[PDB]
């Protein structure tokens, strides 16, 4: 097991009695409504938010993909590889998977284009792909994705999720915040919340039996 949670209650109640045991390389789908507790459950794993009741025991390093895409002043390559070792093939694999090839190629300076003030501002969906690229690049043991497809088109995310979450990271442990039935259809475990309380937990077979 790479990430665990037993009898967890949180106050910034935001999360009430959280229970899950995710094995290595398994995809966990954290679903819920606006305000269910999903964006705060990941803060518990990251250690940003400390709990009141229960314990959280995870192994390895964590790589977060923020719900709100943020661009760092610099190049596209710098936005993806800053602070991490440049592996030519690890880098190329992430571009093709996060659907950034065309987006990059359409530029005069390519992956070297500057995104600061007095430069090139990228669309709400290009910021989202550069941010998920930044995450899937960083070699970690646990991947926390918080609504990575929120500002992305349904055809593109289809291409990202299946070639990124389900292929590129297929042997890495993941936690995806998504409502999409199409995504929960692919998960190993499903956790569903409403105002903190875990309304659902188990396999997709247990869900598709409701």
């Amino acid at each position, epitope marked *: 097991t790479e990430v665990v949670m037993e009898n967890v209650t949180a106050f910034w109640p935001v999360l009430k009695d959280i229970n899950f045991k995710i094995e290595r390389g398994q995809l966990l789908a954290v*679903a*819920g*409504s*606006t305000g269910a507790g999903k964006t705060s459950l990941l803060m518990m794993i990251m250690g940003e938010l400390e709990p009141s009741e229960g314990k959280i025991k995870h192994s390895g390093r964590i790589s977060f993909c923020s719900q709100f895409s943020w661009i760092m002043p610099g190049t596209i390559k710098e936005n993806i590889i800053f602070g991490v070792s440049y592996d030519e093939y690890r880098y190329r694999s992430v571009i093709k998977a996060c659907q950034l090839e065309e987006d990059i190629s359409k530029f005069a300076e390519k992956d070297n284009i500057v995104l600061g003030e007095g430069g090139i501002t990228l*669309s*709400g*969906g290009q910021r989202a792909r550069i941010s998920l690229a930044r995450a899937v690049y960083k070699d970690a043991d646990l991947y926390l994705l918080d609504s990575p497809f*929120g*500002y*992305l*088109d*349904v*055809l*593109t995310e289809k291409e990202i999720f299946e070639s990124c979450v389900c292929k590129l990271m297929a042997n890495k442990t993941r936690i995806l915040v998504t*409502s*999409k*039935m*199409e995504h*929960l259809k692919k998960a190993d475990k499903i956790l*569903i919340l*409403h105002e903190g309380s875990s*309304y*659902f937990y188990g396999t997709f077979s247990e*869900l598709q039996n*409701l």
Partner: nanobody, 121 residues
Framework: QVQLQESGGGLVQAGSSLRLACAAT????????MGWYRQAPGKQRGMVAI???????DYADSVKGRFTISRDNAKNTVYLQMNSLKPEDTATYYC?????????????????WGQGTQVTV
């Protein structure tokens, strides 16, 4: 008993405007994201614009500044105000909505496509 219905498409001359529409009828607990897509004759399907529940608007580069999007959360209808049309804008425009059926008990959405309204410039 969940349908996405297109309106507004057809034949126009270059430099003129058009207004598309897309309504979801049926048992709808909630709809998250809505989007307008186009598939050119021969090209792969591509987005034109997308609107979140809150109303955040991402657009394709090929249409920015000309096409505008809007959604009414009470009527479940997404519009695509297609101003300053280019002959290059000619495609079959399709509609998308992440829909939670009232039948469903969990608040979990499903992808729904429209019939696809032909736009010729």
């Amino acid at each position: 008993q969940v349908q996405l219905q297109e309106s507004g498409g057809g034949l126009v001359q270059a430099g003129s405007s058009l207004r598309l529409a897309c309504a979801a009828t049926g048992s709808i607990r909630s709809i998250n994201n809505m989007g307008w897509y186009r598939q050119a004759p021969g090209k792969q399907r591509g987005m034109v614009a997308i609107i979140t529940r809150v109303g955040n608007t991402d657009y394709a580069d090929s249409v920015k500044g000309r096409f505008t999007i809007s959604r009414d959360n009470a009527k479940n209808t997404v519009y695509l105000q297609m101003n300053s049309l280019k002959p290059e804008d000619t495609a079959t425009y399709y509609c998308h909505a992440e829909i939670t059926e009232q039948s469903r008990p969990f608040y979990l959405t499903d992808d729904y496509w429209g019939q696809g309204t032909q736009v010729t410039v």
